[PDB]
Design a binder for this molecule. Structure first.
Ligand SMILES: Cc1cc2nc3c(=O)[nH]c(=O)nc-3n(C[C@H](O)[C@H](O)[C@H](O)COP(=O)(O)O)c2cc1C
Ligand SMILES: Cc1cc2nc3c(=O)[nH]c(=O)nc-3n(C[C@H](O)[C@H](O)[C@H](O)COP(=O)(O)O)c2cc1C
Ligand code: SF4
Ligand code: SF4
Ligand code: FES
Ligand code: FES
Ligand SMILES: [Cl-]
Ligand SMILES: [Cl-]
Ligand SMILES: [Cl-]
Ligand code: NA
Ligand code: NA
Ligand code: NA
Ligand code: NA
Ligand code: NA
Ligand code: NA
Ligand code: NA
Ligand code: NA
Ligand code: NA
Ligand code: NA
Ligand code: NA
Lengths: 417, 156, 417, 156
């Protein structure tokens, strides 16, 4: 018995990450084994760590946490440095509009766990961690139980299936800080401290948990490892376009008829996501904007871009928040400002002060109480959150809002007039 | 004179023993305490500190930082209402209006009986089911007041 | 999305239960249904034992709406006294002349029915359920299919529904022209892929049914009540209308009234009130000559003050009211009824097979003025000798209405002789 | 010889896979066949029986029993006219007259172009909207000839 979870709609054209998680329920180990679960692990333990790294490299799998760093190269970087090494699954998923990782956690834990074990073995880590946000309590208990199940079927513990490889997966809980999704702050939290990002360099692959080589990979990244081993890198790359191959999860919300998670190839266009898959818009209103989480803002001019990692592609995490023609852009921007205000950890002064002032001033604008100086101030702080910032939050806390200013001037101008 | 009752002390020790190093169990311990009491007593921190082999101010620093923890208001049931972008578009204010109609409180407030506290939170990662709320660990999409009233009748 | 054209049958309720949404002539999809507290009775049901649900439905006093008035909870009790697997079947064959009450649940408020099916199936330990819907309701069929998909998406169907450990799949089957397939044993024969031939009873479906296993067949309207029993509790439900015939009843009114359509009323309403207070009186303010209770009973203008309940002096049947006014030829009407039974006898039993044909063929001769004196005496005799050796109720009732027109309108028949 | 075009065969196989037992899918398969061909081709029955793992006489008997199925006349649109009591009381005869005037056929007949067949049927369960008729899956109240002509103009 687990806490109540809303039944998010899930749909797939590729039937990989959502083969089971398209069904809104906990798939336990037996049902997992039935479809050939844990056989990729078995195959992996009969391979060298170097070869697994090679396959993940050649698959062109890239991180799904937002920074988009090649996974195999990441792993290769860590194994250049003496052990012991640690593997961390990043399940903090707290950016507005993003709910894709949780459906893997809640419906198909063993897809995740199988990935962690292969990955850990690939980098020689005997200690792995899932860091899951505190507001995902059902995910927490589902993971713990699925870990117990894996242990009893002999997939975890010492000398896993006679291989000589030992592994324990510990499940840690967050407690309300979006910044703890930043990998260095994640590691700080795991070491029992506040979620304060560390200055880079050094980089975790060199110096992370207890100063030791540490690979942090997103849940959805890890969800792909089973498949790369199972089908081989060459069959894997045949999925979608040669350039950006592989399955990808798109959490679609806002003013669409069918909000939910969609598993699609990355040659899909943003327009297709909205109109082909998510049923179009509510009331068939015209799309005004798409928020790529709390990162970017695309106009209705920019729908025909691919959902990939090309220069001109959507990028980000595939998070699609749809706003239609009656949605007030300033109102929406304020909500973004508020998020950043609540999530700056405050160690960098321009970020600390910017996030605060951007929200406070924008709220005055919104309420029609801004002075002429408040307006110029707002403009100014929005351009000056980033300086001296030691992590990406401060780099992007102004980004989306700046884009709305540049793409919807007429609607802002009305607030100024 | 503040001492954790045995059942709680036991559960805390489980967490402290779970990770390789004791200090890694601080957030699990703090979730436990808040679950047990309905808030984090200030008196709990010193003894927690001793079990973790950490100084008190470290522990206090941690409580101040992490938004899920509350040292001020006891509540049986925390109603976490999402106030972020997608829930806002889809009707956070209708959810709150309906909560006020039923419980008689606004965000920040605790019922007189101390049974329900409304906690405004950032995106809960269920945006397709906006507007989203939790009641302790349970999570739900808000549909309407009558639907909400029935859900809340489940918590006694 | 897009469904076949359905006439917009008028609906009106004084109780606002079965016809709460279905008073509005359109499809009510899951979101609207949830907004009105949809599927919350399912949630409460799954937190009770099956035994309690059976108990509540028993104490509700709910009696079958399909025509035989068998107490619904008792029917469930009998089934669950036999070992599983068990099956649940929603009878949506509704093919009796004058009866169109079930279609408006199906087409307008499908989730009310689906909710009821799930609770009922859980009550009897059935993991497989069917809706058997007549082939001449294509819109209903596509609406039900779509609604089931919506239910799966929100996790009300499939495996381990809402963490309860209860499994359910609902399959939708279509009839293909045959009124007899509404008789429960013949329905079951059809579901097995055979002709609709009723089986000899005993044994009864609750003991030996689909594939010889215990089977509960319930009528659409019956199942539409289950939501209200669990939601309100059996005591409050029992308080609707007269205590001996409690709960909402649907009443399809057709023929010579101002407001033909389906009325949701309590069962202490009189036939007179149905016609004049609710259905707007008669066309042209003509005098009522008769009311056909579908193709089952014929009531004179002297019989309008009876209750629309299941008492011995009440209306009975399915509450189907077809109003005939002073200029309607009763013999012409009797012919249409004889023709119905002619077309619908399955033929297994000789007196039914031959009697249904002869009653219609001879009465056609009477109507057309071409009957010999022997034809008159024949018709009288065949009318009294359809029932002998009958396996099912069709042969028992094929002459009933017609006999009543001969007793209650002798002067009109004498004109034909 | 006779085989199902794959387009039809696929739909057939879906129905067969839909129920737990293949033979349950017989009525759905037959509806599908009558939709594809505008009737049930006699030749079509042996290969259906194969797919259902049923004897041919079984499926023949089934086709004979159920009145919606037609093995004799190909029609693009089946005009199902209710001939039972209520529709009779409220004007079935006027509907068929209007049908004859417009199309030039009576019940049981097909138009020369194969386009329309009048099929007299029992109560269609819409008696309040009598007199009732269907054009394939679409269902309507008959009001008048002119109104009828406009409905039929929609079937090309
Ligand atoms: C403010 C901030 C929040 C982040 N939140 C997450 C998160 O919730 N989940 C995640 O996997 N990565 C998150 N990241 C990215 C991580 O720092 C890191 O790039 C990632 O977890 C590595 O996994 P990947 O290489 O497989 O993408 C965040 C980064 C920043 C700057
Ligand atoms: C000839 C004949 C036709 C019937 N047609 C129907 C029908 O269309 N729908 C129905 O629900 N019951 C019909 N019945 C009654 C069923 O056999 C059975 O009593 C009923 O479906 C049980 O459900 P209930 O207890 O909820 O009424 C028919 C019975 C006979 C004898
Ligand atoms: S940029 Fe902002 S969030 Fe990142 S470390 Fe600095 S103050 Fe903290
Ligand atoms: S009574 Fe008539 S309809 Fe019923 S089984 Fe016998 S022949 Fe068939
Ligand atoms: S915006 Fe409310 S759950 Fe994401
Ligand atoms: S009598 Fe014609 S539809 Fe009922
Ligand atoms: Cl990062
Ligand atoms: Cl100290
Ligand atoms: Cl019966
Ligand atoms: Na989920
Ligand atoms: Na967190
Ligand atoms: Na980083
Ligand atoms: Na604000
Ligand atoms: Na260690
Ligand atoms: Na805090
Ligand atoms: Na959540
Ligand atoms: Na039928
Ligand atoms: Na028929
Ligand atoms: Na009474
Ligand atoms: Na019909």
């Amino acid at each position: 018995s687990y806490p109540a979870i809303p039944r998010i709609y899930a749909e797939t054209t590729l039937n990989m990450l959502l083969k089971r998680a398209k069904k809104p329920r906990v798939h336990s180990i037996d049902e997992y084994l039935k479809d050939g679960g844990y056989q990729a692990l078995e195959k992996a333990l009969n391979m060298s760590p170097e070869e697994i790294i090679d396959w993940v490299d050649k698959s062109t799998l890239r991180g799904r946490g937002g920074a988009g760093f090649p996974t195999g190269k990441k792993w290769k970087f860590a194994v250049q440095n003496p052990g012991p090494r640690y593997f961390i699954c990043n399940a903090d998923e707290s950016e507005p509009g993003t709910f894709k990782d949780r459906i893997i956690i809640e419906r198909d834990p063993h897809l995740l766990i199988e990935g962690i074990i292969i990955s850990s073995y690939a980098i020689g880590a005997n200690e792995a961690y899932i860091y899951i946000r505190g507001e995902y309590p059902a995910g927490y208990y589902i993971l713990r139980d699925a870990i117990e199940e894996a242990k009893k079927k002999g997939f975890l513990g010492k000398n896993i299936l006679g291989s000589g490889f030992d592994l324990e997966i510990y499940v840690a809980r967050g407690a309300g800080a979006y910044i703890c999704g930043e990998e260095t702050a994640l590691i700080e939290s795991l070491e029992g401290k506040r979620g304060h990002p560390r200055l880079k360099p050094p980089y975790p692959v060199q110096k992370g948990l207890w100063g030791k080589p540490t690979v942090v990979n997103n849940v959805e990244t890890i969800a792909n490892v089973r498949f790369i081993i199972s089908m081989g890198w060459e069959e894997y790359r045949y999925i979608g376009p040669s350039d950006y191959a592989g399955p990808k999860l798109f959490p679609v919300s806002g003013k669409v008829k069918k909000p939910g998670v969609y598993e699609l190839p990355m040659n899909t266009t943003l327009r297709e996501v909205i109109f082909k898959y998510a049923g179009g818009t509510l009331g068939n209103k015209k799309v005004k904007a798409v928020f790529s989480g709390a990162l970017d803002c695309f106009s209705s001019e920019e729908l025909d871009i691919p959902m990939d990692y090309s220069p001109l592609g959507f990028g980000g995490t595939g998070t699609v928040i749809v706003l239609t023609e009656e949605d007030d852009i300033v109102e929406a921007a304020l909500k973004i400002a508020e998020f950043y205000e609540h999530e700056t950890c405050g160690q960098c002064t321009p970020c600390r002060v910017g996030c605060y002032e951007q929200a406070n001033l924008l709220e005055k604008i919104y309420k029609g109480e801004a002075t002429e100086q408040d307006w110029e101030g707002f403009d100014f702080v929005n351009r000056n959150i980033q300086p001296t910032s030691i992590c990406g939050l401060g780099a992007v806390a102004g980004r989306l809002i700046r884009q709305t200013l540049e793409k919807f001037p007429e609607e802002w101008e009305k607030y100024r007039k | 004179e503040f001492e954790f009752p045995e059942e709680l002390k036991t559960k805390l020790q489980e967490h402290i023993n779970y990770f390789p190093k004791k200090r890694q169990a601080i957030l699990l311990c703090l979730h436990e305490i808040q679950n047990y009491y309905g808030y984090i007593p200030p008196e709990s921190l010193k003894p927690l500190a001793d079990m973790l082999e950490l100084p008190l101010n470290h522990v206090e620093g941690v409580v101040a930082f992490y938004d899920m923890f509350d040292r001020e208001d006891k509540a049986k049931y925390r109603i976490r209402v999402c106030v972020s972008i997608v829930c806002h578009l889809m009707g956070t204010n209708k959810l709150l209006k309906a909560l006020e109609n039923i419980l008689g409180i606004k965000p920040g407030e605790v019922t007189p009986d101390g049974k329900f506290k409304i906690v405004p939170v950032q995106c809960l990662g269920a945006c397709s089911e906006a507007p989203v709320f939790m009641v302790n660990d349970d999570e739900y999409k808000f549909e309407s007041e009558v639907q909400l009233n029935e859900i809340l009748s489940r918590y006694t």
